[PDB]
């Protein structure tokens, strides 16, 4: 439902993987943690998982 600009960080909460992302067009204050199942951006994810 909302365009994702980039993945800032990652964590495991409740056995669930979550991504801290920033939405394009919105302020950093709007950044939110979203479980991986909420994302539709394999490019950013695959790219983030490689930057480690």
């Amino acid at each position: 439902e909302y365009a994702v600009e980039k993945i800032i960080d990652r964590r495991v909460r409740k056995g669930m993987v979550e991504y801290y992302l920033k939405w394009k067009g919105y302020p950093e204050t709007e950044n939110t943690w979203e479980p991986e199942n909420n994302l539709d951006c394999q490019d950013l994810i695959q790219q983030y998982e490689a930057s480690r």
Partner: peptide, 6 residues
């Protein structure tokens, strides 16, 4: 790309 916002 995109993502659901909770």
């Amino acid at each position: 790309q995109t993502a659901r916002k909770s």
